[PDB]
Write a protein that binds this DNA or RNA. Structure first.
Length: 173
DNA sequence: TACCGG
DNA sequence: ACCGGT
């Protein structure tokens, strides 16, 4: 029951990859024989929604099923700050399963990702991660972060989690 | 800055 | 340990 944040800067290849596999998604036939039939059955419909990283962990925390990912989307200004003057977005996904791809098998990841082979630690999301109506500053504030906190990949100290309990609850039914 | 370290 | 910097 952990919570992570992943910052997707607009106008960059991470945003492009975020378009393809989280916003648009990938038909499950184009994944058959690269991802297990069981992951495909239980985490995907005709479409899989998934993200990936180059390590298995985030601040030494590994990501497992049941956990949550807030994708912050906006124009990045400094390493971990966003421009609050242009549009921002927050999406919430719930991890279904995580799968590691072997380094002699990362070929297929380039089919839909720019430099995809570098990101062989995949995460699959039970349903398509949901676009919240909150801005990044509105979510940051609920978690006790600076308005423009925009981590590239952050772990949210559990004691902050209760500030967004309303939202996650409302999402389940 | 596909984030860690101190 | 998490943020919050350049």
């Amino acid at each position: 029951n952990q919570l992570f944040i992943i910052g997707i800067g607009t106008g960059t290849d991470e945003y492009e990859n975020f378009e393809e596999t989280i916003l648009k998604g990938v038909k499950r036939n184009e994944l058959e024989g690269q991802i297990g039939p069981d992951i495909l059955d239980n985490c995907c419909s005709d479409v899989c929604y998934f993200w990936g990283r180059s390590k298995e962990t985030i601040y030494e925390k590994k990501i497992d099923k049941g956990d949550m990912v807030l994708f912050y989307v906006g124009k990045r200004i400094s390493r971990n700050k966003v421009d609050l003057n242009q549009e921002t977005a927050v999406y919430l996904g719930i991890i279904c399963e995580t799968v590691e791809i072997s380094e002699n098998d990362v070929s297929f990841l380039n089919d839909f990702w720019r430099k995809g082979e570098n990101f062989r630690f995949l995460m699959f999301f039970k349903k398509k991660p949901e676009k919240l109506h909150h801005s990044i500053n509105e979510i940051n504030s609920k978690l006790g972060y600076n308005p423009d906190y925009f981590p590239i990949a952050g772990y949210v100290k559990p004691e902050r989690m209760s500030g967004v309990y309303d939202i996650l609850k409302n999402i389940l039914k």
